[PDB]
């Protein structure tokens, strides 16, 4: 097998910024990886295309994936509303880590975050499932529009997304 590679084309207030590609660890967290992959292609009839990163905190992370409420209160998995924490094998070791947002144990939906720093305090509480493969510079650029409380200064959207591998 080969781990799937997905991409997001990011736009800032409608201006294309660049492409970020992620490697999804299907070999370690197959269910979580599959959920993110399907949501990136939109094959189930819903997904990330057109959604925004609603909360960005410099030196911490960029959060997005709420394609229903667009405010951090929505989103859903391809398995129904929410699914279990698959495993906590991987850790939040440094910049580029892709991890699942939640509202407590076993509440994974569609929201995720990209770490821009090692965030060890989230280990064992959030399921790590992939990492930035290319375009980490785009993630850094995105960080500039964030703020301490998370509010973004420009609308950061996923203009297009899909699978590459």
């Amino acid at each position: 097998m080969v781990n799937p590679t997905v991409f997001f084309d990011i736009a800032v207030d409608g201006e294309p910024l660049g492409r970020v590609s992620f490697e999804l660890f299907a070999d370690k967290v197959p269910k979580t990886a599959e959920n993110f992959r399907a949501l990136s292609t939109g094959e189930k009839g819903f997904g990330y295309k057109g959604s925004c990163f609603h909360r960005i905190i410099p030196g911490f992370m960029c959060q997005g994936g709420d394609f229903t409420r667009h405010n951090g209160t929505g989103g859903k998995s391809i398995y129904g509303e929410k699914f279990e924490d698959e495993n906590f094998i991987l850790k939040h070791t440094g910049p580029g880590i892709l991890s699942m947002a939640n509202a407590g144990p076993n509440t994974n939906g569609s929201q995720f975050f990209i770490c821009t720093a090692k965030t060890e305090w989230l280990d064992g509480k959030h399921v790590v499932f992939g990492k930035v493969k290319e375009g980490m510079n785009i993630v850094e650029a995105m960080e500039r529009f964030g703020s301490r409380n998370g509010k973004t200064s420009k609308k950061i959207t996923i203009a297009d997304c899909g699978q590459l591998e």
């Binding site: 909360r55 905190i57 911490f60 992370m61 959060q63 709420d66 951090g72 209160t73 929505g74 989103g75 991890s99 947002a101 939640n102 509202a103 407590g104 509440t107 939906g109 929201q111 975050f113 965030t119 305090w121 989230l122 959030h126 998370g150």
Partner: peptide, 11 residues
């Protein structure tokens, strides 16, 4: 604080 929740963001 620095959490990544969905609905009730905490300190």
């Amino acid at each position: 604080x620095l959490l990544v929740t969905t609905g009730l963001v905490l300190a």
